């Protein structure tokens, strides 16, 4: 079924077992242990340094643990990227996710990571968004205008940008 992809990433759900993850991603693409601890890390189009991937975090090391975290780089493209330096500077800490999306563009962001540290409870959810200007995203893994926006319990805690104009 090919390497890891955006589609496989979106198919995988919180609460899934390790075996469900391996079955969807394609076990050949995946690893656990070593640098990645309890997690399952699945490689996409590689090419060398800075290759596309997803990492799925689990509630424990147990074989029956469940997915409590999803992260990816270079697997998801923004649907309509319109972020700019202007717009980035208008984002303020304490904004909700909705307020931020209204500021940066509804189509400018993808999910870099989402984690439920109290799974099955959703309290304390952390969310990192990757947000892109009109030409900023690339699946080749060198960006040209991007930002990191991070939230806890749906409220923006911080932001950082590289190479916005």
């Amino acid at each position: 079924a090919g390497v890891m992809t955006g589609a496989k990433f979106t198919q995988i759900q919180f609460g899934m077992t390790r075996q469900q993850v391996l079955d969807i991603a394609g076990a050949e693409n995946c690893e656990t242990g070593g640098s990645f601890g309890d997690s399952i890390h699945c490689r996409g189009h590689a090419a060398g340094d800075y290759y596309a991937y997803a990492t799925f975090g689990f509630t424990s090391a147990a074989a029956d643990a469940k997915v409590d975290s999803k992260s990816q780089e270079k697997l998801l493209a923004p649907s309509a990227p319109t972020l700019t330096l202007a717009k980035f500077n208008q984002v303020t800490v304490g904004m909700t996710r909705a307020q931020v999306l209204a500021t940066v563009g509804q189509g400018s962001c993808t999910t870099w990571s989402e984690y439920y540290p109290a799974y099955p409870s959703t309290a304390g959810v952390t969310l990192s968004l990757s947000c892109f200007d009109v030409d900023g995203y690339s699946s080749t893994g060198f960006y040209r205008g991007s930002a990191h926006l991070w939230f806890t319990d749906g409220v923006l805690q911080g932001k950082r940008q590289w190479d916005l104009v």
Partner: protein
């Protein structure tokens, strides 16, 4: 061997970009073969070996510990960070950060380690003090990969990098334990498969570090040898090509195939 020089030159014509190459004797430090040995190229992630050398120098001086855990947070993260993003809630040790920087080219791990040594300026100072008066780091990740033509920031020369690597791996610059740790990380490299390793025959040793940057930049530094021990250092850089990654990888592999042949 003169033949390998033919392949390096061919690579330059095929890529439409300058290629720099050195093959050095590991013991003697003598240059065996070279091409554009004194021209500057962007280091990209190959600088991470030099970084962990500087960290190991601090550990030898009792100023740092491999087992020391560093707790960082979202503001520290930059993209292309597969290991540091996973270890966000519970930290990573200096040993784990150097392993992620070298073996996985993890960009956040490199910045965190740069913080421990005092930044790019301090790595450049360490290099100068070790006798490398050419190699310089100026920026942090991800900007150091920009590869602006004729921009000297974050560059090395093939001959300087080769001699620098030899001194990190074999001088008394680092203790023996530290030299062994550095070369063990490089031997565990996970992301350089399509390069020299693809030409390496069973039984040979290789410890290496790759890099990729903007503007077609690509490169690798390595210590390699027959019968499970390194005996030469090889440095290959290129920048400015419009060729694809696979295409750039393939040229480097072929240079590898030739120096292996004519060893």
């Amino acid at each position: 061997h003169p033949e390998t020089l033919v392949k390096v030159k061919d690579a330059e014509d095929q890529l439409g970009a300058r290629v720099g190459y050195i093959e050095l004797d590991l013991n003697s430090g003598k240059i065996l073969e070279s091409f554009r040995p004194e021209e500057r190229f962007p280091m990209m992630s190959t600088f991470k070996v030099l970084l962990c050398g500087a960290v190991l120098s601090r550990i030898d001086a009792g100023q740092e510990q491999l087992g020391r855990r560093i707790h960082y947070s979202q503001n520290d993260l930059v993209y292309n960070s597969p290991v540091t993003e996973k270890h966000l809630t519970d930290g990573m040790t200096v040993r784990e950060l150097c392993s992620a920087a070298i073996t996985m080219s993890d960009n956040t791990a490199a910045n965190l380690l740069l913080t421990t040594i005092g930044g790019p300026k301090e790595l450049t100072a360490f290099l100068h003090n070790m006798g490398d008066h050419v190699t310089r780091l100026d920026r942090w990740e991800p900007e150091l990969n920009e590869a602006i033509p004729n921009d000297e920031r974050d560059t090395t020369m093939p001959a300087a990098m080769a001699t620098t690597l030899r001194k990190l791996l074999t001088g008394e610059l680092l203790t023996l334990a530290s030299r062994q740790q550095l070369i063990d990380w490089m031997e565990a490299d996970k992301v350089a498969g399509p390069l020299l390793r693809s030409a390496l025959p069973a039984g040979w040793f290789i410890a290496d570090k790759s890099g990729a940057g903007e503007r077609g930049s690509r490169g690798i530094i390595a210590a390699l040898g027959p019968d499970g021990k390194p005996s030469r250092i090889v440095v290959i850089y290129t920048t400015g090509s419009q060729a694809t990654m696979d295409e750039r990888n393939r040229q480097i592999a072929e240079i590898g195939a030739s120096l292996i042949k004519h060893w």
